[PDB]
């Protein structure tokens, strides 16, 4: 699981 | 699962 | 600015 | 600006 | 601006 | 601007 | 599953 | 499943 | 600015 | 500025 | 500025 | 599990 | 400035 | 588990 | 400035 | 487990 | 377990 | 266990 907010 | 907000 | 990942 | 990933 | 992914 | 993916 | 908001 | 909002 | 990852 | 990772 | 990791 | 807020 | 790691 | 706030 | 690690 | 606030 | 606040 | 506040 990969969750990113840029 | 990959979730990205740019 | 609101950014949300559930 | 509102960005949401469920 | 509203962007939503369910 | 409203963009929605169910 | 890949979900992206740009 | 791939869901993208640009 | 609000950024949240659940 | 608020940034939260649960 | 508030940054929290649970 | 990888969760990143930039 | 508040930074918390639980 | 890797959680990062930048 | 408040920094806390539990 | 790695948790970082920068 | 590694927890860092910079 | 390594906990660092810089």
Author numbering:
A (entry chain B), B (entry chain B), C (entry chain A), D (entry chain A), E (entry chain A), F (entry chain A), ...: 1 to 6
Paper text:
High expression of PSMαs, which are four peptides of about 20-residues in length, increases virulence potential of methicillin-resistant S. aureus (MRSA). Amyloid aggregation plays roles in PSM activities in S. aureus. In the present study, we investigated the structure-function relationships of PSMαs and their short truncations.
Segments PSMα1-IIKVIK and PSMα4-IIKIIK, both of which are conserved within naturally occurring PSM truncations, adopt the canonical cross-β fibril architecture, wherein pairs of β-sheets tightly mate through a dry interface, forming a steric zipper. Both structures belong to the class 1 of steric zippers, indicating that parallel β-sheets mate face-to-face in the fibrils formed by the PSMα1-IIKVIK and PSMα4-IIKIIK segments. Proline substitutions in these spine regions abolished fibril formation of the full-length PSMα1 and PSMα4. Structural indicators of fibril stability of the IIKVIK and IIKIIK segments, i.e., buried surface area and shape complementarity between sheets, calculated from the crystal structures, resemble those of eukaryotic steric-zipper structures. Specifically, PSMα3-LFKFFK fibrils dissolve upon heating to 50 °C, and reform upon cooling, whereas PSMα4-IIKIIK fibrils remain stable. While PSMα3 forms cross-α fibrils and enhances toxicity against human cells, PSMα1 and PSMα4 form cross-β fibrils which likely play a role in stabilizing the biofilm matrix. The atomic structures of the PSMα1 and PSMα4 derivatives offer templates for the design of anti-biofilm compounds.
